[PDB]
Enzyme design. Sequence first.
Site, short mmCIF file in Angstrom:
data_model
loop_
_atom_site.label_atom_id
_atom_site.label_comp_id
_atom_site.label_asym_id
_atom_site.label_seq_id
_atom_site.Cartn_x
_atom_site.Cartn_y
_atom_site.Cartn_z
N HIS A 143 0.81 -1.21 0.00
CA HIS A 143 0.00 0.00 0.00
C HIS A 143 0.84 1.26 0.00
CE1 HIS A 143 -3.26 -2.75 0.98
NE2 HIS A 143 -2.62 -3.12 2.08
N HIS A 164 5.59 7.23 6.57
CA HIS A 164 5.31 6.73 5.23
C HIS A 164 4.75 7.89 4.42
CE1 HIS A 164 1.58 6.27 7.55
NE2 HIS A 164 1.03 6.69 6.43
N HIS A 197 3.48 11.26 6.39
CA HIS A 197 2.76 11.03 7.63
C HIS A 197 3.72 10.42 8.65
CE1 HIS A 197 -1.38 10.95 5.44
NE2 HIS A 197 -1.01 12.17 5.77
N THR A 256 -6.31 4.86 5.96
CA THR A 256 -6.37 3.53 5.36
C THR A 256 -7.17 2.61 6.27
OG1 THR A 256 -4.30 2.89 6.43
CG2 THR A 256 -4.13 3.76 4.19
N1 X38 Z 1 5.81 -1.83 13.92
C1 X38 Z 1 4.57 -2.58 13.91
O1 X38 Z 1 4.61 -3.77 13.93
C2 X38 Z 1 3.21 -1.88 13.85
C3 X38 Z 1 3.26 -0.36 14.02
C4 X38 Z 1 1.98 0.29 13.50
C5 X38 Z 1 2.11 0.62 12.02
O2 X38 Z 1 2.85 -0.12 11.30
O3 X38 Z 1 1.48 1.60 11.52
N2 X38 Z 1 2.36 -2.41 14.91
C6 X38 Z 1 2.72 -2.65 16.22
O4 X38 Z 1 3.82 -2.44 16.63
C7 X38 Z 1 1.60 -3.22 17.16
C8 X38 Z 1 1.49 -3.60 18.48
C9 X38 Z 1 0.27 -4.08 18.97
C10 X38 Z 1 -0.85 -4.18 18.11
C11 X38 Z 1 -0.73 -3.80 16.76
N3 X38 Z 1 -1.88 -3.88 15.89
C12 X38 Z 1 -2.08 -4.97 14.95
C13 X38 Z 1 -3.43 -4.71 14.29
O5 X38 Z 1 -4.08 -3.70 15.02
C14 X38 Z 1 -4.80 -2.82 14.20
C15 X38 Z 1 -4.02 -1.52 14.03
O6 X38 Z 1 -3.07 -1.68 13.01
C16 X38 Z 1 -3.22 -0.77 11.95
C17 X38 Z 1 -1.92 -0.64 11.11
N4 X38 Z 1 -2.05 0.59 10.36
C18 X38 Z 1 -1.50 1.81 10.92
O7 X38 Z 1 -0.93 1.79 11.95
C19 X38 Z 1 -1.68 3.14 10.21
C20 X38 Z 1 -1.12 4.28 10.76
C21 X38 Z 1 -1.31 5.51 10.15
C22 X38 Z 1 -2.10 5.59 9.02
S1 X38 Z 1 -2.33 7.21 8.25
N5 X38 Z 1 -2.32 7.10 6.55
O8 X38 Z 1 -3.60 7.74 8.75
O9 X38 Z 1 -1.30 8.13 8.74
C23 X38 Z 1 -2.71 4.47 8.50
C24 X38 Z 1 -2.51 3.24 9.11
C25 X38 Z 1 0.47 -3.31 16.27
C26 X38 Z 1 1.03 -2.79 14.91
O10 X38 Z 1 0.35 -2.73 13.94
ZN ZN Z 2 -0.76 7.86 5.80
#
Ligand code: X38
Ligand code: ZN
Length: 257
Positions: A61, A91, A116, A196
């Site tokens: 994405h 990103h 962002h 997203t």
């Molecule tokens: N380093 C990683 O592994 C990521 C960092 C977050 C990231 O990678 O973003 N990570 C964790 O560490 C962690 C720990 C515990 C639970 C957990 N959740 C798993 C699923 O839960 C649902 C939320 O997940 C959504 C992922 N999407 C986004 O975060 C995102 C951010 C900004 C925009 S935007 N365009 O609006 O700016 C759009 C999307 C996670 C998780 O995902």
């Molecule tokens: Zn974004």
Amino acid sequence: HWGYGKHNGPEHWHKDFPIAKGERQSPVDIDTHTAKYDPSLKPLSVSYDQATSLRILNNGHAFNVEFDDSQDKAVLKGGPLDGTYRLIQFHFHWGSLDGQGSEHTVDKKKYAAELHLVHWNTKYGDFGKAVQQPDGLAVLGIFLKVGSAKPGLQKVVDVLDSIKTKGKSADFTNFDPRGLLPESLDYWTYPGSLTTPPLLECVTWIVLKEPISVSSEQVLKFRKLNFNGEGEPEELMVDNWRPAQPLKNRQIKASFK
Ligand SMILES: NC(=O)[C@H](CCC(=O)O)N1C(=O)c2cccc(NCCOCCOCCNC(=O)c3ccc(S(N)(=O)=O)cc3)c2C1=O
Ligand SMILES: [Zn+2]
């Protein structure tokens, strides 16, 4: 699954993510004339001096630069925020042409791309808890327009050839995100969502007034990435942006007269 094409794009997302039609969705159009100066905003603090980048990745994405968020190594505070927000990743979103690509717009003007910087509220312990709270996330958004090269972006650009396709990741240590910031920290702020899926309404949005400049070669390298994985039909990763959503019961506040 979800994407940006005709058959899985923004217009479809509500079918799997009904909050897509919620009350505080992002991005939005920033009407500069009807945003309101808010003197009660505290001064914004972007403290990135100990930022610890880890990795760069193509997730089908966009591409993410991820950070060590186990300590307060790179934080955002002040402004509209009450509490310390830890940087976890940044990103971009970008277009196929220089006249489109940003997610937020300013008086309906689209920029060539949008940066962002994603932060989560440390009062909730980890990112997953944060995305269950109305004030769990703060995203700092920065517009990109095409012009002079941004030196601080070049390292990112240099590595893009190692993560061409979905699922690829490469080591990306010692990157300083301060090199991506404009001169001014003046901003608009409003409550909204992830742009997203799963579009969770978690985000205090802080959108900088001043865009940064990038060269056409830099954004072009963006456009040479792939939505697909290796061995799948090639689909250039371009126009990975959601259009502006209705403001509804929200006022945009500004940090500057
Ligand atoms: N380093 C990683 O592994 C990521 C960092 C977050 C990231 O990678 O973003 N990570 C964790 O560490 C962690 C720990 C515990 C639970 C957990 N959740 C798993 C699923 O839960 C649902 C939320 O997940 C959504 C992922 N999407 C986004 O975060 C995102 C951010 C900004 C925009 S935007 N365009 O609006 O700016 C759009 C999307 C996670 C998780 O995902
Ligand atoms: Zn974004």
